[PDB]
């Protein structure tokens, strides 16, 4: 009569201890995972920082090269134009030279 | 005496329930923190991948430009040489004309 | 789960209080009956003492009367015997008296 | 900690059982005392009845004896009176005889 009540009372005590041990373990496991993930987050931030720095370097070099190549195309076109002008000058000069050569004979 | 028994049993069971609620609350709080962290970590992993991929592309385009620059230098050199030849022909031809015109 | 255990625990407490109150009442009731019966026993002892004293008185009076009556029967028998002797004496005397009366005539 | 719970529950239930046994023992002890008393009280009640009945009988026999004593006194008185009459007749007759014998 009274022993069955104490027996069930002891069992509830057992269940409470188990629930306490389990929840404490789970809480510590979550806390340890939080501290791990915060170290990972900081490592990733530093990795991103260095990658953004490298991207800036190479992007600047690319833009400088693009502009330098645009200038070379411009200069070459201009020298080609000058070549064509000099050919015109040669043509008129050569024509006069031939006239004088023939006339003096 | 007997209401004491009733009262102490009531308060003990109430304390146990309170203790259960508080523990489950703290568990759900830490779990939400873990979820937020996992979302940040994933977003940063993506950003890292895209930065690595972008660095690669820009490097490749830089190599292409360096090669184009070489070819353009060769082209400008050849056009300069032709230009100088034409300049010499012009000057020599102009002085010849001036001489012929003086004589006549 | 835990409330049913505490409820049954409270009930066992109720049963224990009732058992305590009942057994205490019964014990006091028995003690009060003991004290009553001891007063009765002493009263009866004194009643018996006086009855034995009265019996002795009346028994003595009875025995004295019995003996006194036995003596009266004895005395009466003896006086009857003496009467018969005196009658014998009268008979012999009267016989002689008659002789003398007749002879002197 | 947990064996503490087991131990305290065990000792408490043991104390309760002890307390129950002691109470029932004291009850049976007082009950046996009440039985002994009821047997003494009954025996004394019987003795009282028999003493009252005996007193009555002896008183009645005493009354009978007193009456017998009266009748015996009357009888002795009558026998004495007759005895005295006979004594007178004897004495008177004896002196007469003595006189007659002197004369003759
Ligand atoms: Cl050309
Ligand atoms: Cl042109
Ligand atoms: Cl007679
Ligand atoms: Cl006789």
Swiss-Prot record, chains A, C:
A motif (Nuclear localization signal) lies at residues 17-20. The molecule is in a coiled coil structure that is formed by 4 polypeptide chains. The N-terminal and C-terminal regions exhibit a prominent seven-residues periodicity. This is Synaptonemal complex protein 1. Changing residue 5 to E: Impairs self-assembly of N-terminal ends. Abolishes the formation of higher-order heterooligomers with SYCE3. Major component of the transverse filaments of synaptonemal complexes, formed between homologous chromosomes during meiotic prophase. Required for normal assembly of the central element of the synaptonemal complexes. Required for normal centromere pairing during meiosis. Required for normal meiotic chromosome synapsis during oocyte and spermatocyte development and for normal male and female fertility. A motif (Mediates head to head self-assembly of N-terminal ends) lies at residues 1-11. Structural component of synaptonemal complexes. Homotetramer that consists of an N-terminal four-helical bundle that bifurcates into two elongated C-terminal dimeric coiled coils. This tetrameric building block potentially self-assembles into a supramolecular zipper-like lattice to mediate meiotic chromosome synapsis. Self-assembly is likely initiated by local proton density at chromosome axis, which is predicted to trigger antiparallel back to back assembly of adjacent C-terminal ends into tetrameric structures that anchor to chromosomal DNA. Testis. It is found in: Nucleus; Chromosome; Chromosome, Centromere. Transmembrane segments: none annotated. It comes from Homo sapiens (Human).
From Swiss-Prot, chains B, D:
A motif (Mediates head to head self-assembly of N-terminal ends) lies at residues 1-11. It is found in: Nucleus; Chromosome; Chromosome, Centromere. Testis. A motif (Nuclear localization signal) lies at residues 17-20. Structural component of synaptonemal complexes. Homotetramer that consists of an N-terminal four-helical bundle that bifurcates into two elongated C-terminal dimeric coiled coils. This tetrameric building block potentially self-assembles into a supramolecular zipper-like lattice to mediate meiotic chromosome synapsis. Self-assembly is likely initiated by local proton density at chromosome axis, which is predicted to trigger antiparallel back to back assembly of adjacent C-terminal ends into tetrameric structures that anchor to chromosomal DNA. The molecule is in a coiled coil structure that is formed by 4 polypeptide chains. The N-terminal and C-terminal regions exhibit a prominent seven-residues periodicity. Major component of the transverse filaments of synaptonemal complexes, formed between homologous chromosomes during meiotic prophase. Required for normal assembly of the central element of the synaptonemal complexes. Required for normal centromere pairing during meiosis. Required for normal meiotic chromosome synapsis during oocyte and spermatocyte development and for normal male and female fertility. This is Synaptonemal complex protein 1. It comes from Homo sapiens (Human). The lineage of its organism: Eukaryota, Metazoa, Chordata, Craniata, Vertebrata.
């Amino acid at each position: 009569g009274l022993s069955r009540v104490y027996s069930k009372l002891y069992k509830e005590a057992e269940k409470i201890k188990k629930w306490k041990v389990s929840t404490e373990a789970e809480l510590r496991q979550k806390e340890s995972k939080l501290q791990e993930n915060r170290k990972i987050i900081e490592a990733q931030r530093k990795a991103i920082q260095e990658l953004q720095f490298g991207n800036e370097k190479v992007s600047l070099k690319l833009e400088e090269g693009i502009q330098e190549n645009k200038d070379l195309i411009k200069e070459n076109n201009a020298t080609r134009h000058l070549c064509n002008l000099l050919k015109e000058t040669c043509a008129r000069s050569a024509e006069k030279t031939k006239k004088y050569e023939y006339e003096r004979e």
